[PDB]
Every structure is written in structure tokens, then in C-alpha cells.
Design a protein around this ligand. Sequence first.
Ligand SMILES: [Zn+2]
Lengths: 924, 149, 330, 147, 79
Amino acid sequence: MPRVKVQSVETVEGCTHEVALPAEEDYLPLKPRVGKAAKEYPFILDAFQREAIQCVDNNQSVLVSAHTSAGKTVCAEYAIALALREKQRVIFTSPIKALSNQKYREMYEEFQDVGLMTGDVTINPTASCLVMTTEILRSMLYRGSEVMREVAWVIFDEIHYMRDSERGVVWEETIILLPDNVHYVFLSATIPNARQFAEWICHLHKQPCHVIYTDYRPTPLQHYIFPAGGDGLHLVVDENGDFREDNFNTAMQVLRDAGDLGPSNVFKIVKMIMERNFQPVIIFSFSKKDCEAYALQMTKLDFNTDEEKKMVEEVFSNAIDCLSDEDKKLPQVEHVLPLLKRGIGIHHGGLLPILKETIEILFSEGLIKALFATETFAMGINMPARTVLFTNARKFDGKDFRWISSGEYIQMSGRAGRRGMDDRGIVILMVDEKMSPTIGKQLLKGSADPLNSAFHLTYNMVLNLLRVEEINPEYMLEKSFYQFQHYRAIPGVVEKVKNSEEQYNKIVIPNEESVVIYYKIRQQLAKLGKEIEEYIHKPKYCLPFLQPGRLVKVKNEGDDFGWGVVVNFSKKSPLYVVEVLLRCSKESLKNSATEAAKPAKPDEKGEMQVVPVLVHLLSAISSVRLYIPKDLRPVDNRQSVLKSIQEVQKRFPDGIPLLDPIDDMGIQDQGLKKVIQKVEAFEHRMYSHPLHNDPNLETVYTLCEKKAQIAIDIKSAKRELKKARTVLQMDELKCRKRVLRRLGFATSSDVIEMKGRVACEISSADELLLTEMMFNGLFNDLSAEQATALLSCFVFQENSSEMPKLTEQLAGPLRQMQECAKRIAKVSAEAKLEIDEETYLSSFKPHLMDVVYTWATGATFAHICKMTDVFEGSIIRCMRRLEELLRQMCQAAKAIGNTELENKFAEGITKIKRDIVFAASLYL
Amino acid sequence: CEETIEQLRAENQELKRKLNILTRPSGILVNDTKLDGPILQILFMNNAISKQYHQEIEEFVSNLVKRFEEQQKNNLLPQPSSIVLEEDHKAIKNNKEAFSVVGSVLYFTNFCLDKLGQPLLNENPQLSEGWEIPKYHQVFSHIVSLEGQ
Amino acid sequence: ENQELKRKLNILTRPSGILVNDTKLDGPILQILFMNNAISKQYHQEIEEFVSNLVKRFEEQQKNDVEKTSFNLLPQPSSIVLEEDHKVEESCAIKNNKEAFSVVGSVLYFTNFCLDKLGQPLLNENPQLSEGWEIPKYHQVFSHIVSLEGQHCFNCGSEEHQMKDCPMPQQRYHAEEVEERFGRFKPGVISEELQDALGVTDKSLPPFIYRMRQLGYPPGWLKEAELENSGLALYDGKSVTYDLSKLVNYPGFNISTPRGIPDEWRIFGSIPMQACQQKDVFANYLPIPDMSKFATGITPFEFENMAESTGMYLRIRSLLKNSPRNQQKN
Amino acid sequence: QLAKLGKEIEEYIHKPKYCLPFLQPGRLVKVKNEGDDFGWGVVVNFSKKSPLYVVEVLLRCSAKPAKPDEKGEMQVVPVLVHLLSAISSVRLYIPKDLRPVDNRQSVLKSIQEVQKRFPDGIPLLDPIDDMGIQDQGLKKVIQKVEA
Amino acid sequence: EADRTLFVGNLETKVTEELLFELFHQAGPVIKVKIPKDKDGKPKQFAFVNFKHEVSVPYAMNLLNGIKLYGRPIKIQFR
RNA sequence: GGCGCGCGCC
RNA sequence: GGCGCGCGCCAAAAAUUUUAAAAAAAA
Ligand SMILES: [Zn+2]
């Protein structure tokens, strides 16, 4: 169980300093600095910056949480200077490679004693302020490199990137595997659950940790909303921070009126910006082609001047100098210079690396004035603007489309202020008819989502841990911040069960046994009634009676719309949907774009509107039928329908007739007769029951049902508490170990044999399959180019509707690879592991085998770029990953003790690395 | 004795299984029997004509209702063979004579198989409200088994 | 009891012995049941003639012109077969009759609601494939199920007929091939190929210029030089721009006509050049193990891709001696 | 004796209030004066006469029934109410203009068609239930008929 | 591409895409003109011209209609 | 349809 | 002047190319 106590520290307004430390240790205010500061800054230091520096002085780990536009990196620079002064090596771990290169340039210009260690370059390895990507740090720790021997600090940049859900695990492995004497500086975006992370660090390393949270920004922002269809822009969130409900209501009213019924739309907004002097702007669209589309549409504006055009031409020529002739004259590079000339740039993941770097440099200098980029640009280092425009508000994350989370909106709106130059940023959001006040209000009035781990075992972690002694995978599973964030919830459930138990023990009905029996029989009668209802709703016994005038009663669990006149029905995949004509409230019609219907409140006037429903939600299919007007678009027609229902209902003072299931429907199954007989027996028993005949007994029934609800809650909480006291993933680990030992990797007593040792190295690709293929002798027959082509199967992870036409030299081995994948998938599946062979084998996309084989034999880059439909950036990324993977494969084949495969992989890596695809970055 | 009652009740239930069609749900509060009350009961048979003209038939009935309502402001007691619709059990004044069937016709292609006929006014078709007297010459005018007129 | 019950039940009794051959038409039709209300007593002959007219209308269209009726509407399970008084022996013909006699509907029309039961027959459980169903017109706005909101003819594409017999009915930044699929040209000027094909040589003015000056300056090329002054107001609690340098050059219409070419305004029908059409007039108007423990067994970590600072960034930075931010900051 | 019983049954039928509402302009009856029967005649109208009642059937004619070899003249004949052998129940679709010979010939052909449809006899009306005669005397006569 | 397209007919056989494109470019911005390809690959007795703007087809009709090309008038139609 | 070329008839 | 027949011509004829999206990243 966690043993950590958190104490707040008195501080100036804005920042909220707190310290989480082990329970046994007592708290004493950290001593004021002594001596000369490691480095001094010209501008005044804000409160939170000063406190972070103070905490860095006393060699106590610290976690800073503040807006990117508030200057967190000053603390990291101070820590680096302090570590360098004492002749102490330091490491700066950053998520992405591009940000790593930018930070390397900045720190090299600063201290001149820096190095880089990313996966595609090793500059000045024997430095004292290394900068690296967390993956390489993890690899160093697992392989026990001595470089980490002397480190006195480690600085993690943007630890909020730990919830990535695909590579947000390496952070936890690296944090766990590090020794206890190395201190930590974590820099994160604003998150609410910072104290939990501080407590996790304190518990895991036994050392105190500090948290500084500040929600202050230098330049205030004003928000605007553009309703697609309207004309102007409305001021929803003022610079003061308060929300103006009236203007948002007006904007959504305009949107609703427009939807009830310059050339483009973003073109108008950009022109308005140009003419209103909000020039330097970033247009955020969440597609690789919406950005290009909106960029090309603006072929009529001109932002720059002749001198700026000259400078842009000079910079572009200097940058592109590094390429080769035929690579210089590529269409992609040539047809973008005109865009840069007049002050427009596009920046998404599909472009070549060189164009992205050049556009970043130009924007930083200020030549560009309108950058159409995806969210990849939101993390760039110190590249703000005076305005940020959101073309869309629905992004496709890994799983499926969704509205952008308020965290991402805050992060992107944080790129809308430059300290001193412009004294008020403007953020403009373009909404659509799909947006409804239930989404816009949340997005504008939300807060950053918490930080929740994404730990999940993998074969590489398991194999590497098994290789080294004095540690086992259970150790990693038990200290993963998943187990911590789970154990931290036990007090809540304990209090919940205590309170619910007391509530259970409080209310006592005057009579227990007889009232309980009465409740039980009544509930059983209700269950039998529901069984009959489900029997009615059969495909062949309910469809004929649903007609465009049919009167039905519809209610969902706990909510009843009431009587509605069936308007239509249809099928879909089987399940059927019946469009009925119910009553709905205005608060439910307004949000109808992305909401389900809700019943209107009888005390207030509603509106008769069409609602789709499923057959399962129909209670009674009444026999009555109405004369439908056949035109239900006007409001008055539906009001007349409501009046007709009113009259029909008033014509049957004792209730509308209902179709009799047994005879009217025409069902002759023994089930209905037996159920009816049982219902008759139960109702007779109830009527003859001494308690039932007694009137004034609804109060006792209400108390009894409340007690039953309390009992259900207590049962749920009890099972939760009993399940929440054991490791949540031991079954996964045991299944993984079973798979490893059955295949031939591990041994009876968890001893790693040669196969497992070899499979330890291969990291980026899939480990089990590659090791198994190499061991059997699959690669012993393929050629160097064929081998590289085939390896290209494991590194592509992009959706693509196109398909290959593999010839009789690349198709052959693909069948064998798929066969081995099937064998491995079956072995895993029979070990009670939730693996679907179809999906598992559908992830080895061979779409690039022909491209890579053509490119690995002396072919240009335009030639191959014309052989596919995916962007060129994706081809370059795949080729870089294949290069690194082939390096690792060469090392593994060396380890096995076989040299011929080493030669084969060496030939592949010789023939697949010549041209722009591996053009050294210009940020170094 | 009890065997006889068992047989009778079994037969009655067996017959009333199909008598559901001629069953008007009870609890209907319909006073002013002359105007408020059913109009027809069109048992659609299994013939393609009715199958594909159901909608036209319903429109025709609605048109009859509208026409009578419009021209209202602009008796024929049932014949001895007038049955009453059987109400399922779940002041019958104005609920007795309202659900009285007068005329049951099964329309074939070329002859309407009729039964229960239809009423008239004190044996006076020339005044009754449903009879369509054809046009004929009456060239005989001699009663077959009595002195001629 | 049973006497009156059977009196009521004989209403559904069809006499036996009725020979039937074409069951789809050699059988009964709707068996109306009049009742004791004026709206039904008065209009008896109207209803009888209406059903006869329904038969006649079916005869006029189905039997004569379309001659297409092959419905497969089997009775729905709530159907009923009319009882029959036994006066002839059951056989194949009488079973066929029972097939013919099958109530597939029932209604009791009141003034403003019909106590229907037995519903209507079905065709593959879809009203669009049915016969008597009529679907009203509505909105279909919610599109969120209450139960679970998270759900060869070229003319029309129809794979049932031919297009000729069917009455029924973005771009990559570097792909500028929209206007270069075949070639590129210019407005105003006349190319040699157009000169030769059009049948008009250099000495003769281009012909379409006549009707062009008859009409006016093209709007097609005027829009290109149209930077509309987008009017958007920041609602807090038009002077369109013309680029007068992209105007096309049209000798003989606005610019001075070429010298030596005769003014053939009387030929082909036209009027002489007007002041308004002149260029100036209009244009101006606009227990972790030690590191020695992990490394045992596996290949030690290595450095690969050794490189040195190319210096390209230093050159680019030196080139950026001045720039907007650099000038403003200092 | 049984002839007397049949006479009593059909005297119960031919009473006004139990037979007139069934006399409609298409009602297909059969009329037969002693010895000579016309065949099947369609009612066309009926009326009182200062009390006796008369029914204008449409019968084949040579008033006497037409010969088998000849073709009936198919004319309206005003028979007495209680000369009707059997008030069958198949009401026909009448043209409303029985003046031209074509209409009457078509009516004859329609009756021939109806006869063809029913091989064994034609449905009749049962006085017990169809006409709703609740006379205990009729019940006694029925019992006598059954014995 | 329905109201921004214009149909042409009464054209000499040698007339190809380039000539018609050049002729129609004067009236307004022309995106592409395709001489219809017969099932044998031969041209057809008509052509389609696509205009960038929606206010260009009426003017192209009112200006280029009955123009004598290759000594042969051309009949032009909307869509 | 006519420019009409050409031939024939009244 | 009137009428008939062999026929080039433009005049005018139709014509009118059918089949669902999506961000980022590395040992
Ligand atoms: Zn079609």
C-alpha cells in the first residue's frame, strides 16, 4: 500500500506549492539557496519560476505543471547549469525526434557542451548534457550501459505524453528502472491530478517530491465562435475569463436557423484577419488534405513584400542546397516555393522532412504569416502566433472519430500569444450544425483531462526482465502507476460501503416478512409481464400491426414518452427501427444534432416530433389506429395529430384497448399459455394475500424497494472492494509466460534460452515472429533486396484502400510469413489469450513491398513516389524505420552465431540508404 | 349433467376463438348513437383487388364521412334479422342500438352473396334510404295467381 | 346462448360447393358490414357502386394495358379463414377454396379512428416492397436511436435495365495539372492554330471581337480580378476590391485597334467601338541490480550513425541578418 | 303430411316482415305456380296494393314459362308475394336499365353463369337464423319436419 | 460540374481538345475540354467545355455561337 | 420549306 | 402567267461520357 503524505506550503498567489514525502520523514522548509546562482536571466522571474529554482537548488525532485506559454524551460535550463557546474552529467529526455533536434540546437547554442543520442544520429556522445528520446534511454537502461553511472539529474519534458496509449509505457519503465540517487525534473502541461504523480514518485523512490501548479498566462485571450452559415463572429469568452452565455445562445440560434432550411468559408475568415490586422495566424485542421485544400484556395492574397520574398528565396535555396540535382527538381519541392513567396505554408505529417524544417524556420523568423498545419505543429518550441483558427472540431484518434477533448483545445489555444509583441491573443472556433450547445459549452468551459497511465505488458519487457537476475516482471507490474492509481481508490470504496451499510441499517419497515413476500411476488409478476412483452415483439408478430396510423405506448427504462402514432418502420443490420411521433421538450430538440430524444415534461408545453426507436422499447401495441394526415412537416399537422390523440384517449375513460397477444396477434406457442397461467396464479395469490387487500400500503412498498436498491449497491461495492485488492494484470503476465515457454523461448523454471536472448534485442518490430522466422531458415533463401522488401511488412502501420500486385519475387515469401504468423497466433490463442487471428494477421500490411524493392535497386525517389498513393512523408518514415530495424536484425543475426545473415542484412542497409529519404536534418 | 355443461362450454370457447373479429372492445363511451358510432367493418379478403386498393377504400370511407358532415346542415329501424356486435367483458343505453349490424354482403366479381338484406320504411321501398329501383317497362301488368291489376 | 352465438357466427359462413379455378380473382372481395348509423345507411348504393367500380377499374388497367400482377403477399399469421357450413365433401377444390377464403384484414371505421386488427400482409417485411402501405412525409431529424444512440444502366446505375431505356435519373499541393493536362494559353491574344483553324488570317480582325464589343467586357475574367471585401463583423456585447493590373487586353474593343486592319463593323453585324467600352473609361471607373548486472548476456549498447554539426543552420542564421522579428526586437 | 309441414314453413317465410327486407332489386328468387315453373327470376321491385303484396320478378316467358326449344322473352312479371318457391341468397349486379333487350339477355347470361358456378343446387335462406324468426310455432314445425 | 459545363456540336473532324480550349478560353477560364472518344477511340460529333465560374456559360453562348470555325458554324447548348 | 439548277404539264 | 417531277445546298434534327475517411509517432 502507498505510504506517502502531502503537505501544502505557504506561497504567493497564483502558484500552489505542495510536497509529497514518505510518512515517517518529517517536513522542514527547504533551505534558501547559498552561493552564486548557476545562471542569471535578464527578465524578472515569475513566482512559480523562482520557487521551482529554489526547489532545484536543494537537490529535491520537482514536477512543474504550467501552460507552455508560461516559460517552464527556464527551470530545466537552471537545473542543467547547476548540474554542469558540479561536473555532474545530466540527461534531457524529450518525446519526439524533431523536438529533440530543436532542443539540441537551443542547448548547444546555450552551453556549447551538449550531445545528441537519437536513433538516427549520435553527435558528441561523450558530453555532459545529453539530449535523447526516452526510447533510447530505456534501451540503455535495459542493456546496462555505464553512461547512466554518473547522472545526477534527469529532466523529462512533457510527461503528460505518458498517456499516449501506444508508447506511453516507456516513460514508466524508464522511471522504475532508474536508481534512487538520481533526481527528477518533470515538465508537464496543466493537469488536475498532479499530486497523484508526485505521490507516485515519492512512494516509488522514497525521496520527497514537489508540485508547483499555476494557471497563469502572460497574454490574455479572447475567444470567438463562427457559426457555419452566419456572417459575423461572436465574443463568447471575454479576456476577463468569464463566459458570455447570451452571445453563445445567439450564435447557436443563428446556426439552427441556417440549418433549418468570398467563395469558401475559411477564405472569408482569413481575409477578415488580413484586413483587420490579426496577421500571424495558425489554421488548425485535423486532416492531411483539408490543410492542403484550404492552402491552395488562397491563391489571391499576398502578405509579404519584395524584400521578404527575396529573403524567402535565399533561405529556401540555402536549405535545399544539401539535396541532389534530380532530388532538387522534384515536383514536391518545386511546387511549394510559390506558396512561401507570398506568405503561406502547409505543415503536416505527409510533407518531406526538409520542407517541414524549412517552414518551421521561416515561421520562427516571421516571413510566413498563415500556416495551415495539423496538431503536430502545436508542440513546436517557441513558435507562437497572434491568432489560432480551428477549421474543424472532430478529430480521428487511434480508435474512432470524436470531438476534440478540452485538453487538446487548451493546448492548441495556448499557441495564441507572444510575450510583449501583441498584448491580446484571439482564438476563433468554427462550429457546424452537428455541434450542439451540449458540446460547445463543455469545450469552451472544460479543463485539462487527468493523467492516467497506459501500462500494458509486451514480449520485449518480459524477455528482457527474465534475462537479468534479481528482478522479475511482477516487480514491474507492482510499481507501474497503474497499480498505484488503483490502490489509491480503496478509501473511496471503503467509505462508500460504510455509508451504504449504515443507510441499509437505518430504514426499517414496520413489518418485514409479509411485506418482503408481497414485494417479491409483485416483482415476479412484473418480470412475467416483461417476459410477455418480449414475447409480443417478435419479427413476424409485431410488424403487420405497426402501420402509419398505429397507436403505441413507448417508454425506456425509467422514462416514458407515452402514446405515439407510429409513422414508419424499417430494417437494418437483424434489428428494426420504428419511427414514431412522440412528444419532446425544447431543451431536447435544441441539442438534437448529437443527442437522443428525451420525454417532455407534462407540466409544460412540448412539441410533437418524430423519434426513431427500437422494437424493444414498445410497451403496448394498442389496437386503435388514427387517420394520419400524410404530411407531417408542418407544425400544425402534428398539433392536429396530438389533438386527435387527446380525443381518442378521452373516448376511453378506463384506458385504450391493447392487442391481446394470444389471439389478436395469432401466436399459438405453449410458452404464452404457460406464462399467462403463471401470471393468473400469481395475481390471484396476491389478491388473496392478507397484506395486498389492505389499502394504504404503497409507502411500505416504496421503503422496501429503496432497501432493495441499497442492498444492490452494497453488493456491487463489496464485489468492487474484493476485486480491487489484487494485481490487475497477473493473468496477462501468466498467459504471456505460457506463450513464451511453449514456443521455445523460456524454460520450465523461467530460464531464458538462446532464442529468448536473441529476441531480446529486436525491439521496434515484432519480436516473437521475427525470431521464429530467422531461426527456422526463412531468411536463409531470400536475397538482400527481397529480404529488405519482406522486412518492410512489419513497419507499415497506415490505413490504405489500395492493394498491391506483388510479382513472383516478393509475393512468395509473403505467404510463408503469413503462415508463420498464423502458427504463432494459434499458439497464443490456445493459451487463453484474447487474440483474434484475423486482426493479428491483418496488421502486416505488405502494401510497400514493391515500392521498397524498386527503391532498393538503384531507382530515383520520384519514380517510386509515383508507384503508390500514400504521401511521401510516410514512405520516408517507413524507410527510416526499416533501416533501424535492419540494423537491429543484423546485430541479432550476429548474436545467433550465424554470419551469412549478417552479410545479407548489411547488403540491405547498404542498398537502402542513399538519397533524400535520409537527408541529414538542417537543425543540427 | 356436468358432462353436458363441460361439452357446451368447450364448444362455446372453441367457437368464440374465431368470433374475435365480431368483437367490439368494451368501455367505449359513445352517446348520441345516431351520429357517434361505427360506420363499416370491411373484412379485406385475400384478393389482389382489395390488397392493392386498400388505401383507396379507406380514402373513400373518409370522403363519405366528410361529405355527410359538410352536407348535414345543407327512421330505418333494424329488420328482425339485425345482430348486435359481441362485446368482450372487461349503462348500455346508446351502446345497445349503436353496435347493430344491418346487412352482410360478400362481394364476388359478378354477384354479391348477401344475407340479412337491409331495412325499409313501413314496407315502402319508394321512400326507404338504400334501395335502387331499376327501370323496367312493366308490359304484363297481370298478377300470375290473382286478378290482374 | 349457442343459438345466438351461431347466429352471429354464420355471418362468416361461406356456402360450400363454389368451384374456383383462378383463386387470385375467382374469389370473394371485401365483405363490408353496414351498421346502424346514418353515414352508412344513406350511402349504401354509393358503396356498392364503389366496389363495382373498383372491380371495373382493375379490369381497365390490369387486364388491358399493364397486364402485370404477380404479387406474393401471403397472409400474415393473424389471418383467419371464413367458416363454412358442411353440405359438400372436402377435397382438393375445397382446400383451394379455403386458400381463396382468407381474411387478411379487418377494420371498424369510426368517425376519426379505426379499431384495426390483424394488421396487413407483408412482403419481405418492408413496406416499400408491400402493396397497400402508404408512408407519410416527415422530418427524420434526430437520427439517434433512443434505445442505443451509438449505432446495368449507367443513367441511374440501376442493374435492371439499360441507360438508354431508363426514364429515371481533394488535390495535392504539388499537382497543378488542373490547367496543364494538354497545354496552356492566354486570353486576349490569338494563337496561330486558332488563326488558321478559324479561317481568319492576320490581315482580318478576329471575328468574335465583333459580338464581344456588341455584348461587353467578359465577366469570366473580371472575377479573377475580384478580391471581395468580405464583410464580417465581430458581434460583441460592399467596397469590393478590383485589381486593375490583371485586366485583359482586347485590341479592337477597349485598347486601340491595331493599325492597318480594316474596321469591319458593318460586316457580320456590329456597332463601332463605344467610349464606355474603351479601356480608360471603364477601367478607371472600377532492489534494482547495479548496471553491471543488466548488461550480462546481451550485446552492449553501441553508437551508430556518427555525425557532426553540418553547419547548415549556422549559414542560414548568418543569412537572416534582418527580418521582421529581428528588426522589431532590436 | 310433410307437404303440409313445408307449406307451414314457407308460410312462416312469406310473412311480410320476415321476407320483404330480403326482396332487393337483385335478389335471385325462384317462382313456380302449381305444375309450371319458370326457373330463376330476379326481383326488380315490390309494392303493396289496397292488404296484399306483389313482386315484379324478371322471368323467361313464351305469362306462361317459355318452352325448352324457344328462348324466353325475359320480361318483368308481377307475381304475388307467396308464389315464391325459394328465396335464394345471391343478389346480382343489376344494370338499372332493363328496357333494352341487351340488358335483359345479359341478365339471363349472368344467371346462367351463377348456376354454372354452383354444381349442386344454390344456397337458400334458412328461416331459423338468417331471417331471425323467433316464433315458437316455427320451432315446433321444424321439429315435426325432422320427424 | 453541371451548370459549369457547356456542350458543343457541328465541329470539323480535325478539331481536337486544344483548338476548342483555345477558342473558349477567351470567353472565360476553361478548366478542360474533352473531345469525346468513340468506342473505336475516334472523336465524336460534339465536345464538352468546363468553365471555372458559373457566370461564364451564358456569356460564352451569347458570344461564341454561330462562329465560323473551319468554315463551319458551331451549335452550343447548356446542360 | 426556299437558293433554286434541270425537265415536263396547263 | 400558273402547275407538276430528278436533285446539290444550307434551313433546321436529335445528341447531353454513373457510381468512403482518418491525426501522430519509435528503441
Ligand atoms: Zn436506370
